[PDB]
Design a protein around this motif. Structure first.
Motif, PDB file in Angstrom:
ATOM      1  N   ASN A 256       5.902 -62.169 -11.047  1.00  0.00           N
ATOM      2  CA  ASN A 256       5.021 -62.082  -9.883  1.00  0.00           C
ATOM      3  C   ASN A 256       5.805 -61.744  -8.619  1.00  0.00           C
ATOM      4  O   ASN A 256       5.565 -62.304  -7.547  1.00  0.00           O
ATOM      5  CB  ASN A 256       4.223 -63.372  -9.695  1.00  0.00           C
ATOM      6  N   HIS A 257       6.755 -60.826  -8.744  1.00  0.00           N
ATOM      7  CA  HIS A 257       7.560 -60.442  -7.599  1.00  0.00           C
ATOM      8  C   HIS A 257       6.690 -59.737  -6.564  1.00  0.00           C
ATOM      9  O   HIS A 257       5.769 -59.000  -6.924  1.00  0.00           O
ATOM     10  CB  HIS A 257       8.706 -59.536  -8.031  1.00  0.00           C
ATOM     11  N   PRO A 258       6.946 -59.948  -5.275  1.00  0.00           N
ATOM     12  CA  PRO A 258       6.072 -59.366  -4.250  1.00  0.00           C
ATOM     13  C   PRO A 258       6.322 -57.874  -4.099  1.00  0.00           C
ATOM     14  O   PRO A 258       7.455 -57.432  -3.903  1.00  0.00           O
ATOM     15  CB  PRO A 258       6.455 -60.134  -2.983  1.00  0.00           C
ATOM     16  N   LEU A 259       5.250 -57.098  -4.200  1.00  0.00           N
ATOM     17  CA  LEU A 259       5.284 -55.673  -3.914  1.00  0.00           C
ATOM     18  C   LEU A 259       4.660 -55.455  -2.544  1.00  0.00           C
ATOM     19  O   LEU A 259       3.482 -55.763  -2.342  1.00  0.00           O
ATOM     20  CB  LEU A 259       4.536 -54.879  -4.984  1.00  0.00           C
TER      21      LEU A 259
ATOM     22  N   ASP B 104       9.387 -57.668 -13.353  1.00  0.00           N
ATOM     23  CA  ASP B 104       8.776 -57.922 -12.054  1.00  0.00           C
ATOM     24  C   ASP B 104       7.334 -58.381 -12.208  1.00  0.00           C
ATOM     25  O   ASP B 104       6.859 -59.227 -11.443  1.00  0.00           O
ATOM     26  CB  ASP B 104       8.851 -56.672 -11.182  1.00  0.00           C
TER      27      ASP B 104
ATOM     28  N   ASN C 229       1.967 -54.542   5.560  1.00  0.00           N
ATOM     29  CA  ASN C 229       2.889 -54.661   4.430  1.00  0.00           C
ATOM     30  C   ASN C 229       2.861 -56.069   3.843  1.00  0.00           C
ATOM     31  O   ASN C 229       3.898 -56.646   3.512  1.00  0.00           O
ATOM     32  CB  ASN C 229       4.309 -54.265   4.835  1.00  0.00           C
ATOM     33  N   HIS C 230       1.664 -56.628   3.723  1.00  0.00           N
ATOM     34  CA  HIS C 230       1.524 -57.954   3.147  1.00  0.00           C
ATOM     35  C   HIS C 230       1.943 -57.925   1.680  1.00  0.00           C
ATOM     36  O   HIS C 230       1.711 -56.928   0.990  1.00  0.00           O
ATOM     37  CB  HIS C 230       0.084 -58.443   3.275  1.00  0.00           C
ATOM     38  N   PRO C 231       2.575 -58.979   1.177  1.00  0.00           N
ATOM     39  CA  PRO C 231       3.009 -58.970  -0.220  1.00  0.00           C
ATOM     40  C   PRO C 231       1.828 -58.980  -1.174  1.00  0.00           C
ATOM     41  O   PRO C 231       0.783 -59.575  -0.904  1.00  0.00           O
ATOM     42  CB  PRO C 231       3.832 -60.257  -0.343  1.00  0.00           C
ATOM     43  N   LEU C 232       2.008 -58.305  -2.303  1.00  0.00           N
ATOM     44  CA  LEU C 232       1.034 -58.303  -3.385  1.00  0.00           C
ATOM     45  C   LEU C 232       1.721 -58.808  -4.642  1.00  0.00           C
ATOM     46  O   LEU C 232       2.719 -58.227  -5.081  1.00  0.00           O
ATOM     47  CB  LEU C 232       0.458 -56.906  -3.613  1.00  0.00           C
ATOM     48  N   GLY C 233       1.195 -59.886  -5.214  1.00  0.00           N
ATOM     49  CA  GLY C 233       1.740 -60.412  -6.447  1.00  0.00           C
ATOM     50  C   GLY C 233       1.638 -59.415  -7.580  1.00  0.00           C
ATOM     51  O   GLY C 233       0.545 -58.939  -7.898  1.00  0.00           O
ATOM     52  N   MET C 234       2.768 -59.098  -8.203  1.00  0.00           N
ATOM     53  CA  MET C 234       2.813 -58.058  -9.221  1.00  0.00           C
ATOM     54  C   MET C 234       2.374 -58.539 -10.594  1.00  0.00           C
ATOM     55  O   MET C 234       2.294 -57.723 -11.517  1.00  0.00           O
ATOM     56  CB  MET C 234       4.222 -57.478  -9.306  1.00  0.00           C
ATOM     57  N   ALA C 235       2.089 -59.830 -10.761  1.00  0.00           N
ATOM     58  CA  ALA C 235       1.616 -60.316 -12.049  1.00  0.00           C
ATOM     59  C   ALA C 235       0.220 -59.821 -12.387  1.00  0.00           C
ATOM     60  O   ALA C 235      -0.189 -59.926 -13.548  1.00  0.00           O
ATOM     61  CB  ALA C 235       1.644 -61.842 -12.080  1.00  0.00           C
ATOM     62  N   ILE C 236      -0.517 -59.292 -11.409  1.00  0.00           N
ATOM     63  CA  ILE C 236      -1.845 -58.763 -11.692  1.00  0.00           C
ATOM     64  C   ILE C 236      -1.755 -57.533 -12.583  1.00  0.00           C
ATOM     65  O   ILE C 236      -2.669 -57.261 -13.370  1.00  0.00           O
ATOM     66  CB  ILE C 236      -2.591 -58.467 -10.378  1.00  0.00           C
ATOM     67  N   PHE C 237      -0.660 -56.780 -12.493  1.00  0.00           N
ATOM     68  CA  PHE C 237      -0.497 -55.586 -13.310  1.00  0.00           C
ATOM     69  C   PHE C 237      -0.255 -55.908 -14.776  1.00  0.00           C
ATOM     70  O   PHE C 237      -0.301 -54.996 -15.607  1.00  0.00           O
ATOM     71  CB  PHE C 237       0.642 -54.733 -12.757  1.00  0.00           C
TER      72      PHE C 237
END
Lengths: 1070, 966
Positions: A741-744, A737, B633-641
């Motif tokens: 860049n899946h949306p959380l 994920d 509940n706006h989406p947050l791109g998980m690639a930042i993690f």
């Protein structure tokens, strides 16, 4: 409705430039082509034109690449959600590109302003020209055609340049993307997958275009790697995220590899190199490329002659496998033909009675019918002044005369007459005029030479063979033999596991490592003898190709394998230790800092200790350091039967924490219950579906868990997030994920939830690791860190271990035992591994001509193979921007690469060059890539051309030979780059063949005396070279041979450097 | 591409049932309506029918509500992205609903299995009937019509029930949502905005349906709040999120509020109505039988002073023959005993007859009548030391006023809670969003009543001991006094001032939490603070500079830049960026070398939050103290993690619910920062407590720098002033009750009885004694009583009949057992309707037993043994004031009640008679009758009824009326 774009890449099609966007041999639809078609769809929906509609693309995600076929049509459907500002591109109902597109309501020309460079005013007068830019791009796998070649100029760092505007929005923006990857230190193909935001304003684009003196309007492109922004004209690409694309094996050319070895005329047989030698001799002794052969020999001769590029074969030379039959065969054969008879004094008498002269003997009988010839012309080509070429021209200028001309090289055993004759044979003068040689190449001084004007040369005329070389008593000639397909292996104590072909588990072999040729053991590093090396999920993701090797953080070259993150074994002092490594842990030996090393206690086995480092460091960093697990909390540990899960379970239960585990098997449930008695039947959930969320929420009273150790993905990840309690901690140990860049949804954070991206990989490239090390050590003393279950595969079963633990049935950790633990003491290794060329860091390596096409790539390959002291010899120094960029990169990354003007053609120049190399360090390798070209027909050839073409190669190699012999006792490599022109013949370059053959003889003499020696007969080189940069574009058929790629060239060079053969050849058939 | 759905609510239209989905008086398109529309679009795209297409909805987001007009048509455009599995519902180009829709490839019937309840239901026989369910829903503001009234039955907890199936998916799933929100402790109109996942499988829906004895198809519904799921039939709703939509201020319930004060000015038939046996009803009927001699009907009440024949005459006049009878009363309502009784056998009677006035009542020498006067519109203001700031109408800063606090009428004293006088109360951003209506009151965690005001989160002042303190509170900080735990109080240093210290508690607690406890900021770490000019930003800057951290701050103006430069001299020119733009990201990335910042304290939103996330470095910490992207509940791109980045959702409001040592860590951090001088108070703009509205509108625009502080009391020069009593200030009177006093509601199990009981519980009543002859029968009564008992109120359901004096004495003793009787409410009523012709003296006796005799006995027993009585309220009817057809007995009983209350108030004792109009949403006109015109007056809604009752309880008038004209 839905806008449909029928992408036709045909000649009359209005989108034909798309055939020029070739990546790794496939015509791919450009990532900016989707933006263009979505822009067109938005313009149609809004009623405007593209040039009148400023557009903004947001969160553009490229889900797959569209392969444009050679023939046919691809239909791309663009659907817009104007209310949602979203778009989507579909090929056949499959999502291709998604994102947000909308009209730019208030376009700002100030956005398209070039940001200041992080290092402004480089004061660099040398830049990357268009040809050099796209040569470098092609080397990386970007086969952009003329329409997509829009970078007319770029800086050596790729942070700035010029972009050609050709009234095309797809090509211009694709060149913008090319500039963003020109300066990237990454290797290989990189394709755009996500772009944060693209802003296109044609209004300011038109005003930012300025015409040059060519009268072609251009723009200025700037790439800000700090800001992650590319601006050129009226386009602003921001947040571009290129992802590595594996290079297809289909595009990988398969080259023909041969060894050039002397073959005596006088020496089962059908499947032996003797038949190939006889066939090659017959092909050599022929008027033209037509091969009229009449005959179970039909299954071998066409196959053996197939690798010859220019040979036109007509199979129905005479081959057979008695007096009347011999007479009939002689009558059928034309004058000068060859009869090859295979059978088990009588045969010789019959041949004499049939007026057949035997020219070959393989114990296969080779017989040639003599052709009436007048008194031959004897021309000595042994003159150092090349005064013989004038007489050569004089005799070969009389087309009417058919009198044979016998060349002779009775002196100067290192005579390149072989290549010269090979090139003359297909020239229009000398095809049948008998431009025949005779060379006395004495590899040893003990063997006596053959005196001229005697019966031996009389027998030479009797045989009338074109090639006749006297080599240590026997009479024969050099010939090409197919190289053995097996990779050479040597007994080494230092080896590592590598996948020779990416994505193939069956390709796993043990390869020679760089920890033996160079062992710089100093404080801060330790050469640890690995006894057990365990596998991790990352190892399979690497070896199966699902994970790109470059996705592993750290400075890793494109050749080394990164399998193994953890080991256990011994130390230099001999203490039993277990260590944590970023990569290369699956090896016989690992160089590792003591900071990432523990001490294995007395009770622990070395095998069981091989599962602790990665798994328990990960669990400790995720739980204590980051998750901050207080005692008595509630944890949801996913894949608790795996490695990291088991350690997290142990750590949490050491603090008396309620634990929820997800396991995809009742067997794993039983194993966890047995291993950790504190777990309850309600502590176990399902990891193969979302119902673990319902289980956790029901069993936590709807409150949720205080921590989540999530290795799951997609809906399982979302359910894991939903499992979180107020003030809960989410530790992301997985990467799918994150990588996609899946949306959380950002509403879980309303529960005071902290989201952790936990990657225990920045510890190897950034210190704070000592905290996790201390935690692991403390857990070892307290018994919290318990050794995992270890499935053991021996060193020879590394492939078996990889394909076993890939099935997912393994419980615990899979350990590859490299060296069995000795029970003699806890304080007190040869293996056949594939030979890989590696160089010590303390030795100096010389590449004469190293600033050229092949020279620069060979230098870079040597750098990747461990060369730290490099000397590049050029006649002119650094002239091009590409050379400056490569040398600058090598110097910056730590190599002592020195450019020297000293010419090897002069003996004093070679001595000075060797002294300069020895100044940096002992000379461990000499590479002669110096070359000049005076190609032309023999009638236009002049002696001075031979002088100036043989000085770079023949005399330069002689001088390198002498100086290395008298001053380089530790030399390990002596490589000269010859050409297939020498091996077979290329009309128009006779002196080139002469120089190459002379280099070959020098290398053979070097290797005979036990000194290092290697001559490589290179075919046409594709990515870089001399013929490619000047004229040849892409891969055109040159003399029946395709231009070999640099990747294949370097692989073949690595193969050749580990062979005992003196001279070897490599080329790719058309 | 776009499937057009023209929604028509006309009678002939197939979508006429949608008129029944009225919410807060507006016909709204249901969320399940969007689900069905998208389902139909997907079925059309796949060439199937909805009943043959199992469907899955994912991440359904409702961006706006579609209003269906009475006349006209609304077109909803549905566009499907099959490749991305997404859909979109648009109305006139505006995004309405977005999410993921796709065919359920593998429909699992095991999904639609009812989850086990966390606890078994004890009251299985006592459930909520359909009428009770929708009465409760309508009370919450859900005006569901017959088509959307699909909940046949529901448990008291609201976790189970049955849903009637009418071959309509919209109605069924809407009733699913209604059952989901039925067992909700939150009060108000909650509408779906997000649903995580919806699985509809009509195949198993058909099997799950079953037919009752009524030949009506029904489906069992189960709501599991532990799993956050709702399952009914073949529909599975998971992760339904509902946000409280504010009720529209365009409420047609504008009651006409009136007073009832005594107003001095053929053959006669005299009937003495003073008899207590009502034997004169037959005589009155006989008199009304005649026509000519019945013209002078003179019914006189001489003996009893509280006879209350005024309602008799008012209601009998409406009957046929009432005006002809010309019923005229002689009521000797002598409020005081010393007044002389006007003799009805003297010339006074002759004068009264000559006057021929319709109503003649004697009152201490005045010959007048009872007339209705309009009530004064001014809200009663009283001098109190315990007041709070509240917005009378939500979203209107103009309607900001001081209202009497719950501490004034209920003084609590217990360990672990401190009553601190408030000298300076600081406005916060959440307070502005509450007053402007942009933030719902329910968004703030805690147990807040509907009428509770949550303005004010921070204060400074003096505690009970007189020590100078400044404290942090979840809400109610904008008050003259605050009752809070001592764990949230800091001692104000000697060099500090109360005004100065009234800026620290929220700002610095939030900054210290986010930076140290959550962010774990280490010295030397590059740090990005958004809106550094504001309070929390300034505190974060102070903390970071105390730790020697490089600070990047974003400000909206050059003036704020200059202020930050002057305040924190350690910031250079490169430390400041723009907060009103995305360019702070470029500035940070350039000035940090492209690495990023180790910490981000973000209060920005939308693209300004994504840019801040892009500013993060490797191992960066993102502290999200903002709420817009969190609530949306706006989406947050998980690639930042992938940068080893920690994302913190930092909410300081979570410390007021548990108050464990986790808050004590932040308290110790703030105290240490105070003692080291790290915590330095911000600049304060002070508005006096007399003018709080201007403070709200001043800070709302945002020119303020630092903190906006409301001064309740000027800090007198002293260190520990012993008194510390708040100054007496005039505030709007509000009804509050002591926790130690017991309150009796006669007939408190009725509709209005239960509503008044709930209102009293919301007003601080802790000891309730509801009386009913038949006890608890309906499931609604049981649910309300058990909810109050679980809340902590001592609710006693007594059967002591107030009709008998012994019964009233026993009732008062039962109340006194709980505590002193602080108030008695008489709502007991029985109804014997019918015209005077078909009327019986027994009917009069039965109707007057709860009201007339009940008030007799209640007044007597309260006089004897209720010294601490504060309320004596009886609910009369407008039928007494004006008259109703066939309700003479009701009018008589109500008028007798009003006379009793008038006498009680004249004697100085508490007394209140409320002439209620048609009461809505509960009661008798809701069960017997059906928003229906009754006697020309609309039924007053219970929110308006409770507001008017609160207004009436703080009035000096004996009798007041309330009704809504049609």
């Amino acid at each position: 409705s839905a806008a449909i774009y029928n992408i036709d890449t045909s000649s009359e099609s209005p989108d034909h430039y798309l055939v020029d966007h070739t990546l790794d041999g496939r015509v791919l639809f450009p990532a900016t082509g989707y933006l263009s078609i979505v822009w067109k769809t938005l313009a149609r929906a809004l009623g405007l034109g593209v040039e009148q509609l400023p557009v903004v693309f947001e969160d553009v995600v490229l889900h797959q690449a569209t392969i444009l076929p050679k023939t046919g049509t691809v239909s791309l459907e663009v659907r817009l959600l104007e209310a949602s500002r979203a778009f989507e591109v579909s090929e056949n109902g499959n999502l291709v590109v998604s994102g947000k597109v909308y009209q730019w309501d208030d376009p700002d020309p100030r956005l398209f302003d070039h940001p200041e460079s992080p290092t402004p005013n480089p004061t660099e007068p040398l830049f990357l020209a268009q040809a050099e830019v796209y040569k470098e791009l092609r080397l990386r796998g970007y086969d952009y055609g003329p329409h997509f070649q829009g970078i007319l100029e770029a800086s050596l760092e790729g942070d700035s340049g010029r972009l050609l505007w050709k009234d095309n929005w797809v090509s211009f923006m694709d060149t913008m993307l090319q500039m963003s990857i020109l300066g990237s230190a990454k290797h290989g193909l990189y394709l755009p997958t996500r772009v944060t935001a693209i802003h296109i304003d044609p209004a300011t684009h038109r005003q930012k275009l300025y015409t040059l003196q060519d009268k072609a309007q251009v723009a200025d492109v700037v790439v800000s790697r700090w800001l992650r922004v590319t601006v050129a004209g009226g386009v602003h690409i921001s947040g571009l995220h290129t992802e590595s694309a594996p290079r297809r094996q289909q595009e990988q050319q398969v080259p023909i590899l041969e060894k050039f070895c002397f073959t005596p005329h006088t020496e089962g047989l059908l499947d032996s190199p003797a038949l190939k030698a006889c066939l090659d001799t017959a092909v050599e002794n022929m008027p033209s490329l037509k091969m009229k052969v009449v005959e179970h020999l039909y299954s071998r001769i066409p196959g053996l002659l197939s690798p010859h590029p220019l040979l036109q074969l007509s199979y129905t030379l005479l081959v057979c496998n008695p007096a009347s039959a011999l007479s009939n065969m002689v009558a059928a054969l034309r004058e000068g033909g060859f009869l090859l008879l295979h059978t088990l004094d009588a045969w010789e008498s019959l041949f004499s009675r049939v007026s057949l002269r035997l020219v070959g003997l393989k114990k296969l009988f080779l017989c040639r019918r003599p052709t009436p010839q007048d008194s031959p012309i004897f021309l000595p080509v042994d003159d150092t002044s090349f005064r013989w070429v004038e007489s050569l021209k004089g005799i070969l200028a009389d087309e009417d005369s058919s009198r044979p001309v016998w060349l002779k090289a009775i002196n100067c055993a290192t005579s390149g007459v072989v290549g010269l004759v090979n090139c003359l044979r297909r020239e229009p003068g000398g095809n049948r005029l008998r431009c025949v040689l005779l060379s006395n190449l004495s590899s040893t001084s003990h063997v006596p030479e053959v005196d001229p004007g005697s019966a031996e040369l009389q027998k030479v005329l009797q045989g009338d063979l074109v090639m006749n070389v006297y080599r240590d008593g026997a009479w024969g000639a050099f010939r090409h033999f197919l190289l053995e397909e097996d990779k050479p292996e040597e007994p080494t104590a230092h080896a590592f596991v590598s996948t020779l072909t990416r994505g193939d588990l069956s390709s796993i072999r043990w390869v020679c490592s760089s920890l033996r040729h160079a062992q710089p053991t100093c404080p801060g590093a330790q050469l640890c003898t690995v006894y057990y090396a365990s596998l991790n999920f990352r190892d399979i993701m690497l070896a199966t190709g699902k994970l790109s090797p470059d996705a592993i953080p750290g400075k890793w070259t494109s050749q080394d394998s990164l399998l193994g993150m953890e080991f256990s074994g011994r130390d230099a002092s001999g203490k039993r230790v277990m260590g944590l490594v970023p990569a290369k842990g699956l090896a016989t030996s690992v160089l590792l800092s003591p900071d990432f090393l523990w001490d294995v206690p007395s009770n622990w086995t070395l095998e069981e200790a091989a599962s602790v480092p990665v798994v328990y460091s990960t669990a400790y960093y995720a739980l204590v350091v980051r998750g901050r697990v207080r005692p008595g909390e509630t944890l949801l540990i996913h894949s608790g039967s795996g490695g990291v899960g088991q350690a997290a379970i142990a750590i949490a239960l050491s603090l008396g924490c309620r634990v929820f585990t997800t396991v995809g098997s009742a067997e794993k449930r039983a194993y966890l219950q047995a291993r950790f008695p504190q777990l309850d039947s309600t502590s176990f959930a399902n990891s193969r579906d979302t119902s673990f969320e319902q289980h956790v929420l029901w069993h936590t009273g709807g409150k949720g868990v205080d921590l989540v150790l999530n290795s799951l993905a997609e809906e399982k990840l979302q359910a894991s997030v939903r499992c979180l309690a107020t003030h809960g901690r989410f530790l992301e140990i997985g990467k799918f994920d994150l990588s996609q860049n899946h949306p959380l949804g950002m509403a879980i954070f309303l529960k005071n939830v902290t989201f952790h991206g936990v990657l225990l990989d920045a510890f190897f490239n950034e210190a704070d690791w000592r905290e996790v090390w201390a935690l692991v050590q403390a857990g070892i003393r307290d018994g919290v860190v318990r050794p995992l279950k270890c499935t053991v595969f021996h060193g020879a079963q590394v492939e078996d271990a990889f394909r076993y633990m890939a099935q997912g049935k393994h419980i615990g950790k899979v350990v590859v035992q490299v060296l069995a633990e000795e029970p003699e003491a806890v304080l007190k290794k040869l293996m056949s591994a594939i030979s890989k060329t590696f160089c010590p860091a303390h030795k100096s390596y010389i590449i004469a001509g190293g600033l050229g096409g092949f020279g620069l790539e060979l230098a870079q390959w040597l750098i990747q193979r461990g060369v730290q002291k490099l000397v590049l010899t050029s006649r002119s120094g650094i002239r091009t921007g590409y050379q400056a960029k490569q040398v600058r990169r090598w110097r910056r990354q730590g190599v002592q690469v020195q450019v020297s003007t000293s010419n090897i053609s002069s003996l004093e120049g070679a001595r000075g060059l060797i002294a300069e190399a020895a100044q940096l360090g002992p000379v461990g390798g000499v590479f002669n890539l110096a070359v000049v070209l005076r190609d032309g027909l023999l009638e236009n050839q002049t002696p001075e051309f031979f002088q100036d073409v043989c000085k770079p190669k023949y005399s330069g190699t002689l001088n390198l030979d002498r100086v290395t012999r008298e001053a380089c006792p530790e030399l390990d490599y002596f490589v000269v780059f010859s050409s297939v022109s020498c091996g077979r013949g290329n009309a128009g370059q006779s002196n080139y063949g002469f120089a190459n053959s002379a280099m070959e003889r020098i290398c053979e003499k070097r290797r005979h005396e036990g000194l290092p020696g290697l001559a490589v007969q290179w075919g046409a080189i594709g990515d870089v070279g001399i013929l490619v940069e000047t004229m040849s574009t892409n891969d055109t058929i040159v003399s029946g041979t395709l231009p070999q790629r640099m990747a294949s060239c370097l692989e073949v060079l690595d193969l050749f450097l580990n062979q005992p053969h003196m001279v070897l050849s490599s080329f790719v058939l058309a």
